[PDB]
Amino acid sequence: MTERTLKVLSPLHIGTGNELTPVDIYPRENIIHVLDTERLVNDLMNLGELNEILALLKNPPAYIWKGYIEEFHLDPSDYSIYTLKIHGRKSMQIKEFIKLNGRPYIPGSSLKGAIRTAVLYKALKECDARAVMRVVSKVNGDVARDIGRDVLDYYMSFLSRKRADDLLEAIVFGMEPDRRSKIRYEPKRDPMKALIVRDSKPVGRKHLAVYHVEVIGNPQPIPIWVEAIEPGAATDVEIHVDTEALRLNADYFNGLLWECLKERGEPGEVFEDFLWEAVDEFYTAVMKYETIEVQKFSQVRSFYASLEDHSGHVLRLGWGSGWLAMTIGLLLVEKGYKWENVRKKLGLGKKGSGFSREFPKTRRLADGMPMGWVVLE
Amino acid sequence: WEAIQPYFDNVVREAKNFLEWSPNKRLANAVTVAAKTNQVRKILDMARTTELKIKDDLVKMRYLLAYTVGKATGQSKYSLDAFHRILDPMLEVLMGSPKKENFEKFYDFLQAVVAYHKFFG
Amino acid sequence: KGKQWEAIQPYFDNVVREAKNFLEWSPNKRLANAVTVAAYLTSQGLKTNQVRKILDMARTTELKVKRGEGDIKDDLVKMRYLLAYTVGKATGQSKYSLDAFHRILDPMLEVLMGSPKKENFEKFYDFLQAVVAYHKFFGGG
Amino acid sequence: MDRRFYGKIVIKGKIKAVTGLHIGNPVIKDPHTGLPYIPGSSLKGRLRSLFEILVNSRLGEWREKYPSLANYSPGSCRPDNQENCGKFFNRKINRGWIHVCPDYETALACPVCRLFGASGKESNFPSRIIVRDAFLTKEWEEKWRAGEAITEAKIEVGIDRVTSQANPRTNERVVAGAEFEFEIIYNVENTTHWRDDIKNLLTAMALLEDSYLGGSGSRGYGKVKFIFDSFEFRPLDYYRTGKDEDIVSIDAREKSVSDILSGFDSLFSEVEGKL
Amino acid sequence: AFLTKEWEEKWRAGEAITEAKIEVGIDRVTSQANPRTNERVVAGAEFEFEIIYNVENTTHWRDDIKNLLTAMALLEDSYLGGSGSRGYGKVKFIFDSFEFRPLDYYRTGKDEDIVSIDAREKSVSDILSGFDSLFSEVEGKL
RNA sequence: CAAUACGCAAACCGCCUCUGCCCGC
Ligand SMILES: [Zn+2]
Question: Its GO biological process terms (chain C) (predicted)?
Answer without folding.
Answer: defense response to virus
